[PDB]
Structure formats: C-alpha cells, structure tokens
Amino acid sequence: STAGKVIKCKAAVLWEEKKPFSIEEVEVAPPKAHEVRIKMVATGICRSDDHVVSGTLVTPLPVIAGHEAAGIVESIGEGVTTVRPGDKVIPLFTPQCGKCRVCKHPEGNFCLKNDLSMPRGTMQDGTSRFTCRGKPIHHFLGTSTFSQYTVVDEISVAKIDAASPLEKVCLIGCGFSTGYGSAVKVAKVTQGSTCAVFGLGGVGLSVIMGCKAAGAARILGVDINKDKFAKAKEVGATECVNPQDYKKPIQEVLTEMSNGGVDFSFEVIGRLDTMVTALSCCQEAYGVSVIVGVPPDSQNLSMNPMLLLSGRTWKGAIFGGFKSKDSVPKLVADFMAKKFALDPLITHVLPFEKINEGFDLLRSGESIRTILTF
Amino acid sequence: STAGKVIKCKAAVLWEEKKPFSIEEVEVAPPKAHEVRIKMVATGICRSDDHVVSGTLVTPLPVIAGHEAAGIVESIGEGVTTVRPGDKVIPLFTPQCGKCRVCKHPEGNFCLKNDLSMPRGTMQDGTSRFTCRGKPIHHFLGTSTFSQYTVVDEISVAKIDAASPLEKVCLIGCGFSTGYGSAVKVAKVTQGSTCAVFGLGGVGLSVIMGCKAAGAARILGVDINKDKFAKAKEVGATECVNPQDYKKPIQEVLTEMSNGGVDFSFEVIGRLDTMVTALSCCQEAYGVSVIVGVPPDSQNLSMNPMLLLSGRTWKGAIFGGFKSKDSVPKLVADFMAKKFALDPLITHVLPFEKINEGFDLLRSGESIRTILTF
Ligand SMILES: NC(=O)c1ccc[n+]([C@@H]2O[C@H](COP(=O)([O-])OP(=O)([O-])OC[C@H]3O[C@@H](n4cnc5c(N)[nH+]cnc54)[C@H](O)[C@@H]3O)[C@@H](O)[C@H]2O)c1
Ligand SMILES: NC(=O)c1ccc[n+]([C@@H]2O[C@H](COP(=O)([O-])OP(=O)([O-])OC[C@H]3O[C@@H](n4cnc5c(N)[nH+]cnc54)[C@H](O)[C@@H]3O)[C@@H](O)[C@H]2O)c1
Ligand SMILES: OCc1c(F)c(F)c(F)c(F)c1F
Ligand SMILES: OCc1c(F)c(F)c(F)c(F)c1F
Ligand SMILES: [Zn+2]
Ligand SMILES: [Zn+2]
Ligand SMILES: [Zn+2]
Ligand SMILES: [Zn+2]
What we know:
Chains A, B: It comes from Equus caballus. The structure is a homodimer. By secondary structure, chain A is an alpha/beta fold.
C-alpha cells in the first residue's frame, strides 16, 4: 500500500528559467484533508508550460509544471467526497470551489481560489507536497502534472468516465476545452458567420473545431508557419493566410477578405500586436474578438479606443469560459459519445522521460500536441 | 413658398478651434433628391459639440456643429418618402440607411454611411448646403443643428409624434438615448446588479436612468465634481464617490465597495485613463465595461490584456447601440407615455442667440443640458 505514506517517484523539475527539465526523484507527501493524490497516466505539452520555461509566465521556481493531464486516484484525504481511489480524473488548473462569487455566477469560471493571478505555487493551504534533494518544490496552478504522482486540492480535480482513454482525454484538461469553449461559449459564434483564428497550434485548432461546430460559414486561419495550414483545413478552416505573404497589414487583408470585417476573431498566440490586429479585423459595429493567448509578463498593449466606441466587443477567457469541475466530466462524456474528435490535435506520443524532446518539438514548430505517457 | 429656394437664416458658425461661435447669416440651399430641409426648433448642447471647439474631436472647419435637436420639416427633395413638410423630426447623427451590412445586422447600429469615423463634413453626396460670407461651410455628422435651417439626408432624419414637445425630445437625439441605451441595450444591465458610472453629465445621468430601469441594486456614481452628486442620486445613484477624496486609486476603492468588482461599469467622460479604470473596476471574471466617452483625437490607451484574459468584457457604442431611425420615434412615443423623464437633464434654457453662454455654462461645470430655442 502507498496510502498515508510519502511516495518517492519520478518528476520533471524546473530548477530555473530557460533550462531543460530535470527528470529525477521527488518525494510526494500524502494528501491532507480535502486533498487528492493522483497517479498520472498522460500529460500534454501546452505552450503555457513552455511560457514558464521562457519567462513569458512568472511563477515561483523551482517548480513541477504541467497542467493538461489525466490520471487515476491513488488516495484521498479526510473529507473528500467527489472522487475515490481508482477513479479516472482530470486535474483542473482553474479550480471550481463552488462557493465564491464567481463560482455562483451563471457565466463566470475564473474561481477566486485560482493560483493564476497572483501565483503562490502551493496547495490551497499555502504549503507544498513536493520535495527534491531535500528542497521544497513549488506547485503549478494547483496541478503539477509533470510527475508520476501529484497532490491536488479537491476543488482542482474532476472525476471522469471510467472507460475514458486517458492518453486522449488529457487534452480536455486544457487545450481542447479552452479552444472549443472560447468559440462556442465565450464568443458564442453564430451560424453562417465569418471567423478569424490567429494561431493554429493545439488551442487554435480547437477554436476552429468550435467555430465549425457552431456552424460558421467561413473560418480564416492565420499563421506565420504555413506548415500548420493543412491540419487547420482538415478541422474546418475554409482558407488559411500567412501575414508574411502580403505587403499590407493582415488586419487590412482580413477586412478585405471578409468584405468589411469578420464576425468573430480569436487571438490564440500570445502577442500584444496580434491581440490588437485580431480586434481590428472584426467588424467595427458588431464584431467580437476573444483573447485566448497568454502575453508576456507585465507588458501593456497600446490601442485606439475608437475601435471599441464604434461597437466592437473585446473579451478574454481562461479555459474556454467553462466552469471546470462541472464541465470536464461532460466534455469527456461528449467525447466518448463521438461529439468531437481529439486525434487531430495529437501529432506525437512520447514516454514521460522524453519531456525535453517534446518541448523541443513544440518550439521547433513541428508538433501540435505531444502527449507524454508515464 | 421657400420650397425650392435658397433660405437666408442665422446659424452658429465655427470658423476656428478654441473660439466662440459666430452667430451670423448663412445661405441654406434647397434639398436635393432624398434630402430634407428642416426648420430647427430646439437643440441641446452636448459635450461632443464642445469637443469640436476644443479639437478633442477633429472634423473639417469651418463648420456648423450641433447634433442633438428637433424641428419641423420645411421641404423635401425629390424621392423622399419617410417625412413630409410640417412633420416633427429629429436629425439622426448616426444614420440608418437600412441597406448596409450593419443596418441589416440585428445588433449593429453604426451604419456605414456615418460621417463619424472619417469625417468629411459634407452631405452624403460629398457637397455642402451651407454658404457663409460666400464661402462653403462644412456640415457636422450630417446634421448641423446649430442653424435656424439645416439640410439632412433622408437616412439621417426620423419622423416623430406630431404632439411631441420639441424642447424636451431633442435630448432623444443624443444624450438621453446614448446613456439609456448604453445601459439597457449595450451593457444589458441585469436586475440586482451593481453598476459604476464614471461621469455624471447629461449622458452619465442617462446611463443611471437606464441602470435603474433595468433593476440594478447599486448604482455608484463617480465624478470629480461633487456638485453633480445630488442630481445623480435623484435619478437613481445609490452612492456617489469623488476620486479626489481617496488616497487609493478609484478602481481599488470601487472594487472594495463592490466586494470584489462591479457587474457593469461605464466610462462617460472621454479620458483614456478613466476608460482603463472603468474596465479594471468591473469584476475580473464576468464584469462588463462600456466606453461611452469620446477620447481625444488619435490617442491610444495603454492596458494590460490580463484584465481581459480573466473574463472581462470591454465594449463601446455610439448612440446607445440604437438603430437610429427605428428607435428614435419609439423613444419619443415612450417619453409621451411617461416611460422615462427628460426634465432631470435640463438645467438651463436659452435662446439660440445665447449659444456661447450655453457653452460657458457647460465648461464651468454648472449645467447638465442647456436647451437652445430658435
Ligand atoms: N486562455 C487559456 O486558458 C489558454 C489555454 C491554453 C493555451 N493558452 C495560450 O494560447 C496560446 C496558444 O497555445 P498553443 O496552441 O498551445 O500554442 P502553439 O502550439 O505554440 O501555437 C501557437 C501558434 O501561433 C503561431 N504564431 C506565432 N507567431 C505568430 C504570428 N505573429 N502570427 C500568426 N501566428 C503566429 C505559431 O506558428 C503557432 O502555430 C499560448 O499563448 C498559450 O499560453 C491559453
Ligand atoms: N458614445 C456616444 O454616442 C456619445 C453620445 C453622447 C456623448 N458622448 C460623449 O460622452 C462624454 C460625456 O458627455 P456629456 O455627459 O455631455 O458631458 P459632460 O456633461 O461634460 O459630463 C462629463 C462629466 O465627467 C466628469 N469628469 C471629468 N473628468 C473626470 C474624472 N477624471 N473623473 C470622474 N469624472 C470626471 C465631469 O465633472 C462631468 O460631470 C463626452 O466625452 C461626450 O463626447 C458620446
Ligand atoms: O494554458 C492554460 C494557462 C493559462 F491560460 C494561463 F493564463 C496561465 F497563466 C497558465 F499558466 C496556463 F497554464
Ligand atoms: O455625442 C455624440 C458623438 C459621438 F459619440 C462621437 F463619437 C462623435 F465623434 C461625435 F461627433 C458625436 F457628436
Ligand atoms: Zn470559486
Ligand atoms: Zn494550457
Ligand atoms: Zn446602413
Ligand atoms: Zn452628443
């Protein structure tokens, strides 16, 4: 038995920015009250994880990163009612406490217990369950999935279908749900509309999936890497454009293509300039633009508010606007019911021990999602 | 018997920025095809008219300004079908051509025939109906209401109830409709919500009226001029705050007051800083902020897109999001049935000839709306 005992296991520890992950032995404490210790089965490589390495995202180091994953409950602390040992689960990088003003609001999902805004890198109780070489190691978004075992707060885990294929449904933990929800729930893309999607990575392809599902007539994919176009078309893009191909700025190109601006635009990269371009390319009177990408820490964009005064709507969202604990099990059920596909997002499957190679694939432009298997 | 003839009349011509209006004789050409010549009865002094004087709003000079008004049709050009001589009318500074993509859109109102985005200061045919001292004088937003007679395109005029009191209902031509629509139509303020309204002039008061009509539980008025607070409370503000009274920035004060941020905020001033403050003070996950104020020409704001990524919605609107020609007659009908009040906005009345004194009253902080009678 491992319950109630410290587990020694393998994890990918990030000791400092801009270095490879160190794959080594860590100690994982048993869960305290209202906590859940999970044996990880599969975890995806999201660009947000790379942002921690690059310094685009600031979070306390050293850290066990990883937030897009699925595993099986090893044990539960006192008072846990929502999962049991043996359950398949997905860690929730946006928690759902169920009690705060946001959780109580019909539209809101950015639960006040989150560790994104002001990251502490701990459990809810302000402590860490991880040590490595006798040093405490920070958590990441209350998830820390780049480890054979993690411990999460109960509000940061959802029970999912016992028959789920964990090496696919881990994508529901971030990239798929984010993209899909940003289209269907946050933008509320309409039938017959014209959409523009900036960035054709895992998250942008999921936005295309959601736009198609919502009945968009035109879905214009935008990427500087033309190698991304074929897959974008497979999942629903009607045309793809590379800004580098044009003499005019792409907002102008897109406005011309859409005969005066798009209905819905999406920034799915993480650049300040493309956030403004995506806003500008939506129709000035009734267009809607959704920011999905994570921008570099502490940088402000510059924009002319006349873009809004004419009637545009600008919004952003975390995790596709989904209330995480309510939504994740339904999304997995929908997947098992063949309501959407995940395979188009998965280009590579590697053992966990090849985590660095997985990051290199992302950074080189060659992968969409690499799934790491434990 | 003036039909088909040039009319000589008095108008308030602005020859130069930052100068008084010159009340002097102009020549008003008869209406061409699909044009309407109107004998003005009443016009309000809106801060946007002052922006033309101050150079906050750039439009070609010399100009006859004025956009919030009502009058009586003197004559119609060939092919006009929607008004007749003798009809009471309100000029529409935002046209409604009924044919463009925006007019056909269920939500949009910023008709593509507008003269706001890239002002030419002409009629739709790119010419002027006004001469003064033998020189052509520009139009303003297709309306030019600071004149005993004006000529407008058919798409820029609405027929209103023959029994309308024009000295009141002129406010439906800008300030009332803008503020009230910004709350009820653009923001979609909900029952029991908390709203913050920045700027307690004619338009901000109208926002308050709309928030109260929509059932908001708390309506927090924000102004640096505490003399504006009494009237704001009369029309439904539950609390008023002066940023100058506080050591902390007003977004922090308002967040504290609202136990974590407001449901709906409105910028109704025209400052880049208060646009960002207004966004910040809405709840980060589900808050909505609407820009109503007109910013200084060609200036960009700076903001951190994390304010949006958490879930905020930011939008702007012209004329309260109302399709102008459909909406103005209904707004008048509703006023006549006492569905809303206009008297709280009217603080001063003056003859047209005292237009400069009207502007002095606004600039001093003393007036809300001065109504000028011809
Ligand atoms: N809001 C959320 O909850 C959320 C969730 C998941 C991902 N993210 C962010 O979303 C972004 C996309 O993540 P991902 O899909 O995993 O990343 P990714 O797989 O790197 O995809 C990004 C794509 O953007 C393309 N790109 C780069 N620069 C430009 C440019 N200038 N113009 C057009 N295309 C360009 C690039 O070629 C690549 O295909 C990242 O910033 C993530 O951090 C946010
Ligand atoms: N979007 C539209 O269609 C539309 C329509 C009508 C008016 N406008 C604009 O809306 C704004 C308000 O017009 P109005 O009500 O006629 O003007 P106004 O009567 O000058 O009211 C503005 C109020 O803002 C207050 N104010 C000034 N600076 C600050 C500050 N730093 N903090 C808090 N309050 C401050 C000021 O004391 C005054 O009561 C102007 O910019 C107009 O140009 C836009
Ligand atoms: O990819 C999901 C994701 C985000 F959307 C963030 F805003 C963030 F800060 C982060 F760390 C993260 F993982
Ligand atoms: O007050 C209404 C009003 C506006 F909202 C503008 F954006 C503008 F440019 C203008 F001239 C105007 F009069
Ligand atoms: Zn919560
Ligand atoms: Zn992610
Ligand atoms: Zn139109
Ligand atoms: Zn106005």
